[PDB]
Amino acid sequence: GCCSDPPCRNKHPDLC
Numbered sequence: 001g002c003c004s005d006p007p008c009r010n011k012h013p014d015l016c
Contacts, residue, residue: 002008009016 003012003016
């Protein structure tokens with residue numbers, strides 16, 4: 001889960 005994983009989330013502040 002990308003959006004559940006901080007590095008895969010914080011770098012993606014548009015969707016997450």
